[PDB]
């Protein structure tokens, strides 16, 4: 490996660089200021757009004739064919010129805004035509906003008539005109619209499962309750009750629980598993509802108490229950008359009137989608009446964009109907919002305000919600959150589920949620990137709140990562002699070179095919000088410095030797991006990621100040283990100015045969196995275990595995992965919660002996941990004995259900709800029971 | 006519509900069907059997 040669090369050129400190406090403050500036920019855009929308709707004249004055607009679901006959009577359609944009990845037209009209909504009626008429000023302000800030993504007006008008005109995703691709998108169900249209709820869905609802009515009621739950965010608390002469909970929840993905799934399953029987009793049901909304022992959002009554009809009004429980009229009651029937619907319409609610009818599936949007239309009356105290920017949970952009957060601001204002008129429907304006912020746009390459590959940033969900985290992947066993929700991943959970991390999470600032240095179990090992790390969390928002930023930083090497490359010739090493024509004196596909310069496009990126990198280096402001000098300076040091290692120590019997490959990986593997033959067998910061062994070998052997993968279709070898690595630990900084890792891909011969060579001076951390067989002697090399030892002989765990030399941690793809079973691949486990050295002792009490037999073993490595040798002498192979210890990413939600809502994670909410206004006109 | 209304032609081994509410036959004069389907036993029949 030549650790010492690379080391003293590094100290040999202290004049070629400078060591600089990572002041985590200043880093966190700077990144928090940057993120607050970005979000304030988007807030200013939203304010401009909402002001103009209100002004231009105030001065609109209603019409019923658009033949004389056509409305010209681009419909998103228009085919690209030049069809002159695809126009409605009252609307002439624009045919745009679409360019391909890098930011969006789709066809984009900056000349006008596009419009989305749901299929179930006719696109030429009077309401739609008037909206399309008065949204042209929105189009112009879209242009202005994008003109003052070229980094804006989708900025959109979500109309309350069903429309949606986003600025960069792009065709709808896949659902314009495509069989089996139906367009069910509706802007008024979207999480950002649901969020900006009202304040956090406290629902309680009373389902009327009595006898008279059997058949179609119960089908429609369960579908309607599912679609009602699908409009509740994570700031909303909901339970579902059901009454038939006796009221009970439909699920395991006994109170109002948060409406997150897991709890919503539990409630949906309970509602789907519900049956109809017995006589109705509207008093024992509303008593239960009003009692469950009077519970203040549990966590809640003390706002917008509601009761959702899913019945069909009856001759019972229950005046005295309401007069007893709802006399100040603090609780709304929305009554739904589901089904196709001829029961009396008078009391149902009266409960809504006397309790500030509204009455909806759901005669058939297809009417289900519209009425949920409509109670939410009702709930926004108190918000409208609060003129400018209700216009505040709110950011949603991380969700997957519709016009596919990846992960985005949307900032919403509601638009008020202001037709009669200061010239007071009847003001009939001036209590309803016009819509909600949203502007998207890309999560990859937030990632660029937290520069990660001046930190150790173990150091990173992460932000947090008030609910504890992560705005930004290395373990947050663009996949939906799994909710159970497989058979448009947001990506809500808690902080305690993106990492391993101690108690210190719970304290840190609670401190971050409250918006405080502090530091904390402690010892953490840091799971390796390959999700197969656990190392005993050494971390330092520093956090601040991001001012003006609900987010809180933190910076993980290892104790040795307080200093980084700043490349002092200003000679313009030294960098050239470093660069000449990188063309893929010198890969025989220098090793097979891979370069981390970093954003060295914007004119370089990163490529998954690495050698392509290497070619363009060499090309741009050939003519680099005039591109001074085009890109960052620090990244290229550091990568060239590291390439030079790596070349000096590979010639002055590796090219002088050329051959060792034991080795099969010699490699060095550096934080700059250079990962030159020497022989150029194993470089074809090399399967590590070009970006060194995502190399599992590199991150593992920095925390572990010793030799780490990575057992190859078992039963993996590819280069395998025999003709590639087994990975061996140690990290350089140079000292400059007496400071501990680790700039690279060297390593050897030891060949399996050259080890097995030496292991069985001394056998004259059979069962012997070598185990590393995580209990994986590195190599053995029986020569049939070496067939299953790298495979987990518990799969080989699980009895010894369980016993050796019982001595507690191997501790284990079982955790959950909510963002994993999953093979669907029976009652392509869906996403489930996989339950991955990892083993490691529980104790620090070196010698272990004992007797394996196999069933009706006895087995003897001795365990010795090789000094200065992560290995343990097990001398067990027993083969083919009586069968103690009852089960297996399968360390594998096992499909499972998550933690039991019925037990996790009684000790829920700490969570801070929204402060200001609007309900129960006295100017609100309740005489619209519909 | 005993038991002749029970062969409906089902999807390709998917075990789902049969397509069409009519009996079929794999023979020549009976009603053949189409679209990757197999005329196999165990369909209750027309008019709920």
């Amino acid at each position: 490996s030549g650790v010492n040669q690379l080391v003293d090369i590094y100290e040999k050129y202290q004049d070629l660089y400078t060591v600089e400190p990572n002041n985590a406090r200043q880093l966190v403050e700077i990144a928090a200021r940057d993120i607050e500036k970005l979000l304030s920019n988007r807030s200013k855009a939203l304010v401009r757009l909402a002001l103009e929308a209100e002004k231009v709707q105030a001065a609109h004249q209603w019409r019923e004739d658009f033949a004389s004055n056509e409305v010209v607009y681009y419909n998103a679901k228009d085919d690209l064919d030049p069809e002159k006959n695809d126009s409605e009577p009252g609307s002439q359609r624009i045919k745009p010129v679409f360019i391909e944009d890098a930011n969006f990845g789709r066809q984009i037209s900056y000349q006008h805004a596009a419009v989305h009209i749901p299929t179930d909504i006719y696109e030429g009626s009077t309401i739609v035509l008037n909206e399309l008429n008065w949204t042209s000023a929105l189009d112009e302000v879209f242009k202005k906003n994008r003109e003052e800030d070229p980094s804006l993504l989708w900025q959109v007006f979500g109309s309350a008539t069903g429309l949606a008008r986003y600025y960069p005109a792009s065709p709808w995703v896949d659902n314009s005109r495509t069989p089996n691709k139906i367009d069910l998108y509706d802007v008024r169900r979207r999480p950002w619209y649901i969020q900006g249209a009202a304040s956090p709820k406290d629902m309680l869905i009373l389902v009327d499962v009595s006898g008279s609802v059997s058949g179609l009515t119960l089908k429609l009621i369960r579908t309607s309750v599912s679609e009602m739950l699908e409009t509740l965010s994570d700031d909303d608390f909901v339970n579902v009750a059901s009454f038939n002469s006796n009221a009970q909970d439909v699920s395991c929840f006994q109170h109002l629980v948060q409406a997150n993905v897991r709890n919503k799934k539990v409630l949906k399953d309970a509602v789907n598993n519900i049956t109809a029987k017995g006589i109705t009793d509207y008093k024992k049901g509303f008593s239960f509802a009003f009692e469950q909304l009077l519970n203040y022992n549990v966590s809640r959002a003390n706002c917008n108490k509601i009761i959702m009554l899913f019945t069909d009809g009856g001759e019972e009004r229950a005046q005295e229950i309401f007069n007893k429980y709802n006399k100040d009229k603090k609780v709304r009651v929305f009554t739904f008359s589901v089904g196709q029937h001829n029961y009396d619907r008078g009391p149902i319409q009266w409960m809504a009137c006397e309790n500030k609610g509204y009455y909806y009818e759901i005669p058939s599936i297809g009417a289900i989608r519209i009425n949920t949007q409509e109670y939410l239309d009702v709930l926004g009356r108190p918000m409208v009446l609060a003129g400018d105290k209700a216009k505040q920017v709110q950011w949603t949970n991380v969700y997957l964009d519709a016009l596919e952009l990846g992960l985005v957060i949307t900032g919403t601001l509601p638009v008020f109907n202001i037709t009669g204002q200061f010239e007071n008129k009847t003001n009939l429907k001036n209590q309803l919002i016009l819509g909600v304006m949203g502007v998207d912020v890309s999560l990859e746009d937030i990632k660029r305000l937290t520069p990660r390459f001046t930190l150790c590959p173990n150091g990173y940033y992460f932000a947090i919600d008030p609910n504890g969900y992560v705005l930004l985290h290395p373990n947050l992947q663009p996949k939906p959150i799994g909710v159970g066993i497989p058979t448009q929700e947001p990506v809500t991943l808690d902080f305690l589920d993106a990492e391993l959970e101690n108690d210190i991390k719970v304290e840190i999470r609670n401190k971050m949620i409250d918006g405080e600032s502090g530091e904390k240095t402690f010892r953490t179990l840091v799971k390796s990137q390959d999700e197969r090992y656990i190392d005993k790390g050494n971390r330092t969390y520093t956090w601040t709140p991001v001012n003006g928002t609900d987010y809180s930023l933190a910076l993980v930083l290892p104790t040795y990562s307080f200093y980084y090497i700043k490349a002092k490359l200003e000679e313009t010739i030294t960098q050239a002699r470093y660069s000449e090493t990188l063309k893929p024509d010198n890969f025989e004196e220098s090793g097979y070179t891979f370069i981390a596909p970093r954003d060295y310069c914007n004119d370089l496009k990163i490529s998954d095919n690495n050698t392509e990126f290497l070619l363009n990198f060499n090309e741009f280096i050939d003519r680099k000088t005039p591109n001074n402001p085009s890109c960052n000098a620090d990244l290229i300076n550091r990568v060239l410095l590291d390439a030079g040091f790596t070349n000096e290692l590979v010639q002055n120590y590796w090219s002088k030797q050329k051959n060792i019997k034991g080795v099969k490959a010699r490699f060095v990986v550096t934080d700059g991006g250079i990962t030159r593997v020497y022989p150029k033959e194993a470089g074809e067998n090399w399967q590590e990621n070009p970006e060194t910061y995502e190399d599992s062994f590199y991150k593992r070998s920095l925390d572990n100040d010793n030799y780490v052997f990575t057992a190859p993968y078992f039963n993996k279709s590819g280069p395998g283990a025999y003709e590639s070898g087994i990975m061996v690595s140690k990290a350089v630990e140079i000292y400059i100015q007496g400071k501990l900084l680790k700039p690279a890792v060297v390593g050897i891909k030891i060949d399996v045969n050259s080890w097995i011969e030496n292991f069985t060579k001394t056998s004259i001076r059979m069962d012997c196995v070598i185990l590393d951390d995580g209990g994986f067989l590195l190599m053995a002697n029986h020569d049939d275990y070496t067939n299953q090399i790298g495979r987990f030892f518990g799969e080989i002989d699980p009895s010894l595995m369980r016993h050796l765990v019982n001595i507690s030399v191997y501790a284990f941690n079982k955790s959950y992965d909510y963002q994993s793809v999953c093979e669907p079973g029976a009652a392509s691949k869906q996403s489930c919660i996989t339950e991955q486990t990892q083993y490691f050295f529980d104790n620090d002792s070196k010698s272990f002996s004992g007797v394996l009490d196999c069933g009706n037999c006895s087995r003897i073993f001795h365990g010795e941990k090789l000094m200065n490595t992560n290995l343990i040798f097990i001398m067990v002498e027993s083969k083919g004995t009586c069968p103690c192979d009852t089960r297996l210890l399968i360390q594998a990413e096992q499909t499972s259900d998550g933690p039991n939600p019925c037990d996790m809502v009684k000790q829920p994670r700490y969570r801070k709800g929204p402060d200001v909410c609007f309900d129960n206004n006295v100017l609100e006109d309740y005489t619209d029971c519909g | 006519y005993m038991g002749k209304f029970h062969k409906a032609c089902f999807p390709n081994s998917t075990d789902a509900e049969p397509v069409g509410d009519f009996p079929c036959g794999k023979e020549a004069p009976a009603r053949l069907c189409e679209g990757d389907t197999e005329c196999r036993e165990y369909w209750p029949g027309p008019n709920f059997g």
Binding site: T119, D120, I121, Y122, E123, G124, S125, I182, D183, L184, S364, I365, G366 | -
Partner: protein, 49 residues
């Protein structure tokens, strides 16, 4: 329930797979809108069919 409303498209859940169908303002087959149409409708009623 009006000719003004009955335009555009709608989602049909009849097939158990969502499909967009046109909205058509149709008239029933036997429809009484005349003394000659009422005579034919009443004849078909009297025959029992």
């Amino acid at each position: 329930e009006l000719e003004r409303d009955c335009r555009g498209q709608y989602l049909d859940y009849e097939k158990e797979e969502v499909e967009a169908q046109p909205r058509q303002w149709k008239k029933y087959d036997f429809h009484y809108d005349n003394v000659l149409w009422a005579l034919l409708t009443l004849f078909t009623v009297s025959t029992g069919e």
